Structure formats: structure tokens, C-alpha cells
Amino acid sequence: ELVLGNVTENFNMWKNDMVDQMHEDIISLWDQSLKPCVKLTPLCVTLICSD
Amino acid sequence: AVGIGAVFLGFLGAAGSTMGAASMTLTVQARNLLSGTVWGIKQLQARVLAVERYLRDQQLLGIWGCSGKLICCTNVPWNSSWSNRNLSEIWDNMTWLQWDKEISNYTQIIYGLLEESQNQQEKNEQDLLALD
Amino acid sequence: AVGIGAVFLGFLGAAGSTMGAASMTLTVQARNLLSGTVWGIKQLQARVLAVERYLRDQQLLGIWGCSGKLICCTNVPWNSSWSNRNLSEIWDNMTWLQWDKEISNYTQIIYGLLEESQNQQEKNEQDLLALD
Amino acid sequence: AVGIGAVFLGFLGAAGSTMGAASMTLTVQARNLLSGTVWGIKQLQARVLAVERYLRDQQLLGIWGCSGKLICCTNVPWNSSWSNRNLSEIWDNMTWLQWDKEISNYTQIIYGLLEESQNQQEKNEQDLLALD
Amino acid sequence: ATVKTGTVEEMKNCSFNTTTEIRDKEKKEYALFYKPDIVPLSETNNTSEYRL
Numbered sequence: 001e002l003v004l005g006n007v008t009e010n011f012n013m014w015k016n017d018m019v020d021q022m023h024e025d026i027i028s029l030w031d032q033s034l035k036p037c038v039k040l041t042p043l044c045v046t047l048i049c050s051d
Numbered sequence: 052a053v054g055i056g057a058v059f060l061g062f063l064g065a066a067g068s069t070m071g072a073a074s075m076t077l078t079v080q081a082r083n084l085l086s087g088t089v090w091g092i093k094q095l096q097a098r099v100l101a102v103e104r105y106l107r108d109q110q111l112l113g114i115w116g117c118s119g120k121l122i123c124c125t126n127v128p129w130n131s132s133w134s135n136r137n138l139s140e141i142w143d144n145m146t147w148l149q150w151d152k153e154i155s156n157y158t159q160i161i162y163g164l165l166e167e168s169q170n171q172q173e174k175n176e177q178d179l180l181a182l183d
Numbered sequence: 184a185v186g187i188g189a190v191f192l193g194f195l196g197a198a199g200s201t202m203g204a205a206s207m208t209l210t211v212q213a214r215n216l217l218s219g220t221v222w223g224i225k226q227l228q229a230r231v232l233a234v235e236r237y238l239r240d241q242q243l244l245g246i247w248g249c250s251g252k253l254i255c256c257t258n259v260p261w262n263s264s265w266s267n268r269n270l271s272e273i274w275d276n277m278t279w280l281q282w283d284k285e286i287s288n289y290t291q292i293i294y295g296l297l298e299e300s301q302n303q304q305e306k307n308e309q310d311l312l313a314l315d
Numbered sequence: 316a317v318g319i320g321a322v323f324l325g326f327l328g329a330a331g332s333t334m335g336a337a338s339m340t341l342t343v344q345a346r347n348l349l350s351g352t353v354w355g356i357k358q359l360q361a362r363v364l365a366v367e368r369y370l371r372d373q374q375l376l377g378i379w380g381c382s383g384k385l386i387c388c389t390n391v392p393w394n395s396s397w398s399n400r401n402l403s404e405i406w407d408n409m410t411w412l413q414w415d416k417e418i419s420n421y422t423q424i425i426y427g428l429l430e431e432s433q434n435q436q437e438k439n440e441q442d443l444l445a446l447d
Numbered sequence: 448a449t450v451k452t453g454t455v456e457e458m459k460n461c462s463f464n465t466t467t468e469i470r471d472k473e474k475k476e477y478a479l480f481y482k483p484d485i486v487p488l489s490e491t492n493n494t495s496e497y498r499l
Contacts, residue, residue, distance in 0.1 A: 002057065002061045005066070006146070032088070045471050078246055081245075082242060095359055096359070102234060106366070114385075170339065173384070174339075210433075213374070213377075217374060219367050227363060230363050231363065234367065250383075254441060
């Protein structure tokens, strides 16, 4: 709830670091959640197809 | 803005108040410095730094005097080159964050003085206790 | 049961003795609250919680007074709404565990009283050391 | 060898100086006892041991007295069976390391005297503050 | 590799069927190996047959 009163502070949107924490946490979690799942290696066979 | 239940429980909430008026709130910051798969290592590393931050402060306070006192006097005189303001500006006009912009110059000079003041005092008390 | 070498070294060994006679054993508990692959994470989380448990008590005693004293007085009068017993019942009849069942009500009233009792002491000493 | 800016920042550097001379340097040791994939477990385990070591020392110093004082007197007399030297050998001739080779025998007898010495004092003080 | 002295004959020239990207198609392929990586495959009439 804490509005700081008579303070003024120099924010930045593009020089910001916390965006790269979001980015690394995202990739490291995506890649973690795939490790237990079925690798499609046996499925690289010759497909025969029609429309 | 200021309320003693929560002002430093989200930290910082008195920082506009000027240095004299801020000095009644210090306890709320102190009591909040220590709250609480690879994410296990993230939390452990974050916790262990927050402990060492706290202990390294409490150790400095031990060595200079005073051991837990939040506010204490020190028997180190304030040098003319630092003396650039009348006391009333410091206590009644500046904010703590603004005062830091000044005394963030030359700080370790003060810590060297503060440490050695305590050494000489413990040498002196030891002789008084040797007579006593 | 009681024995100051081991009573609290596996903890709690005095708990039936009544509140007055337990006061001689506190050091045995105070000296033991800090004794010492995914299993590595279980042990690290066990250790770091035991440190944070300990430091948070030292921070509270530091803020109310007294900085490391095991026992001390506090300039908070004991209110009639808590005063439901004579001193002899407390020190000579109840156990600490029996006492907890009462003063586990309203405990944060007391911690509010204690913290502010210290603020006003440190302010009042600061004026005297300013006159000294 | 001795130099207060670094002597104990790599630790130990006064160890040849004799016990009386080394006593001016103790602060440099204290202020350095707490500096700072599977390798993350190795580092966390090193940190967490450095913390618990440091705290168990401060816990003892609290319980005996004195909670932050680096040097204090203790109202335990020195028994004749340890009194095997004149004070002038101890303070002016031996090194701290050479002294340790003696009182590394039977040190726990002294801890049992120091701990119990504090109890009897804190009971005595409580009876005086009980009339304050 | 070209018969001759142990300076050249330190190299064997060997060929084998690799599995392509396509699990059902195997392709003949070749490489040079030093004699210490290679051992004569048994169960044969002292032939040109080998393994790692």
C-alpha cells in the first residue's frame, strides 16, 4: 500500500534487467517441462502420402 | 505514507520525511531485513545472501560499538572538510537518501576512525578492571 | 529428568518442574537451537530454516531490549485483563507449558508495547548524551 | 607481518608476535570470519558452515558474557593446576599458538565455570531490579 | 590406406552402412582410422572385417 511521499525516482524501460530474468526463467522452465516427454525419433520414417 | 505497522514491512516508506522525523521509524526496517529442481538452488542462494548481508552489518555494529543499539554516539569528532552544513539542515531539511549523496564520499575514513576508537576504549577499560 | 549437562541437549527435559524452578536451565536450550543430489537440498533447507528461526529471535530481543540477556525487565506494566492470577500460582504452581495456554492469547499486544518502550528509552538517552 | 589493514584479511598474520602484542589486532580476524550444477551445492555447503561456525561462537560469548565485547573479565579464578606460569611469560614471552598447546587440555572445565558464573549473576541482578 | 610401410599403414581405410536421418534408409559411407582404434572382427576366415 506504500506511496512513498516526497520521493522522485529515475525509472527505465529499455535498460531494465528484470525482463532478462523473465526471459531466462521462461526458457529454463519450458525446456525443463519437455524433458520427461516422448521423443519422436522412431517416427522419422519415409512417409507415403496423398491429398 | 508513514504508518509504523507496515511502512518498512514493504521497506522504505518513510524516505520523504526528513532525517529527524525518519529517526522514530528505524525498528520497522530492522525487523523486516530477514523475512521468508534448479529453483531450489535459486531460493537457497537468495536466502543465504540475505543472512550474510544481515550478519555483516551486525558485526560492523559490534566492532565499532554499539552492539545492538540502533542509535549511538561514538567519540569520533566530525572533521571540518565534512562540516559543510549547519546541523538544522541535516536534521530538519534533508532526506536520508539526499544526505547519503554527500557522505557516500569518503565513508571508509569514518569506519577506520570508528573501529580504532573502540580498540583504545577496550584497552583503557581493561586497565580500570585490572585495578578493580 | 532435570540435569544441566543434557536436559535441553535433546531439548525440553525440564518441562514439568513449575515456572520458577525451570529458570535455572535456559542456557541448555539457548546453546542447542543451533546444533549441527536432492538429499543435499533437504539438508540445506533444514539448516537454513534453523538459522532464520534463531536470528529472528535475536532480532526481536535486540529491538525490545535485551540484546543477549536471556532474562530482563521492560517498563511495560502488567495489565489487569492479563492479571487473572497471583504471582505464587505463576512461579510456584504452573509449568511454562501450562502458562503458554494463557498468554498465547493477545501476545502481539505485548510485542507492540515492548518495541515502543525501547524507542522512547533510546530517544531519552540521546538527549542526555547530547547534554553530556 | 602485523598491519591492521590486512594482517587477518588473509587471516592469521600476527601469529609470531607474543600474546600481549597480538591483543591490539583481534578486530581484523573477527571482521573476516564471515566474508564472501553440483558445484552450487559445494558453495552453499561452504557458506552455511561458515555461518553456523560464526553463530555458535557468538552464542557461547552471549551465554558466558560478553555478547560483543572481544575482551572481558569473568569472575572465575584461575586454578593452581593451570597456573603453571608467571603472568609475564604468558603476556610477554609466549605466542597465542604456543599457549593453546597448554589450555587445549581441559578447556571444558573452564566453560562449565564460565556458564555457571553467568547464571548466578543474572539471578542476583533480577533480585536487585525486583527492588528498583 | 595404400599398403606399404607402418608410416602409411598406421591408417586403415574402412567403410560401413550409416543410418540416415530416415530410420528405414541406410547409406554406405567411409573413413580413415588409426590401427589402435580398430580390432580384427573374429567369426570369419581372417578377412577384411573389423570393429571399433
